[PDB]
From TrEMBL:
Domain Helicase ATP-binding intervals: 19-182
Compartments, as annotated in UniProt: Nucleus
Protein's organism: Chaetomium thermophilum (strain DSM 1495 / CBS 144.50 / IMI 039719) (Thermochaetoides thermophila)
Record-given protein name: RNA helicase
Domain Helicase C-terminal: 196-342
Span within the parent record: 549 to 1177 of 1222
Amino acid sequence: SIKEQRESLPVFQFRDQIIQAVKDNQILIVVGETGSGKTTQVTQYLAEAGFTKYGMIGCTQPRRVAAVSVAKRVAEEVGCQLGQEVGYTIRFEDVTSPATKIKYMTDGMLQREILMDPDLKRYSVIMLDEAHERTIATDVLFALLKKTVKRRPDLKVIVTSATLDAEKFSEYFNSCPIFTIPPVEILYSREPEPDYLEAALTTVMQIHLTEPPGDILVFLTGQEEIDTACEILYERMKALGPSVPELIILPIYSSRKVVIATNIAETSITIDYIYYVVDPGFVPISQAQANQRAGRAGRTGPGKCFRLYTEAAYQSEMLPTTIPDIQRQNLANTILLLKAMGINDLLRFDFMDPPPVNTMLTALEELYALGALDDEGLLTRLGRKMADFPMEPSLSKVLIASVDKGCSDEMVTIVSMLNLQQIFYRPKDKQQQADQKKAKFHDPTGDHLTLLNVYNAWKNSGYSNAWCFENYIQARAMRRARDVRQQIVKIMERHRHPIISCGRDTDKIRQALCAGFFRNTARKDPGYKTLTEGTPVYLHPSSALFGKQAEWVLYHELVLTTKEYMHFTTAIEPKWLVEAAPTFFKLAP
């Protein structure tokens, strides 16, 4: 039943108590142990209590997927169509209606939303649900909401927290109350294991045979560690014997079952029926993170956690408080927005956890080199124009540069294609066959123009799914690209940025892509080496210029599956970098 499921949750007992705490206290810290359902239920409770009469309820989630996942879930519970009373907003996916009482979104959208109205009048209550996997963009929000609260008293702010992080939050938010919302044994090693990988595998071996049935979850650091573990565990399982229950071993890089994942994956997994966790505790992690990890065993039933370090280590060489995760490109975006609110002076800024000065100086230098900031560091005309685009400052810079070069039509398509997850379906039985079809779209210049070739031919075939399948192109991905393209075209048109085509002048198109994306360039070494930092990076085999020789290249992203790899590489001329990417590479007259 919908009611029965809702009432089953631990929060429902404290449901009347939560509403009173919000009604009295302006800012409220909520500690809910995972599986309390504070994420879904609290939003409804405040809606049910009439907080949506004169405002919306907004909740920020750490990832895009989480905001979509919670919104759909809450929609079912509320019993209404997604986007109507309960909707989510994420980048280029605003699933909301005028009739939207409850809204879910990422920190970035809130930052765009707060910049437009520093008082957030459209909202009655703002809740940030990122107890774990908090960033600096989330920390910036805290300081902004602290000021917003001093000018709009009716506004309610809820801030979820981990138990270790809780008291620090309360001190920061003017000593406001900490509302709290209510089994596994943790095992340690007497001496620090010399080899964490060997220890962890032996640990997985003993637990598979010598323990009651449960599923094991292991965490590792690198891909080569994962691959080595898969081979070792296969070899030991086959040698062990046929009587022994089969061990199904699956890795994740986002009879009994073993799952092995990295930190990237740990933040995005809700797998059930696992009674055992192996915690190598070294990426070194924090006590709050270690405790969160321990809890994951306790999800389905009782169970055990195996931390591969001394207890003293837990209490000595591990800090409890979360360290906010800093993304270099996200931080540039955050700083750009802050300067668009007229907030300079990052040194005296009310940061709850001060970011390292290098991170802020690199971000400032990156924006300066893009020409978002002048010599002083004050926001320029170009910076304000870029801040109107909800994307990384490199991509927004490329769009505006293309308008100057009369090639905005091709760029909006290329920019659309960069956001895409998977573009080409590949099946191992027909892998060779798929690669042959991909080759038709290969442009000499590089992957950027190859993406332009894919979308154009898709457009030319009237956007046919049969055509997509004919060429082993993900049909869903192209549809997503068009949705993004249409939204970008509307954003450009609203600002004074027209759409002009130039008949695939590859020189103008790649020149445009050098205006931004100039700190992601590399030169061929007798693989390649990065111009900016000197880091060695390699062409991916799937690249359109992978066979070809190309002395100077430009890459959209830098993936690390095994060794540093450039994602979407395009051959460019050095001249354009001096000319179109001025400040950084003007080592000419």
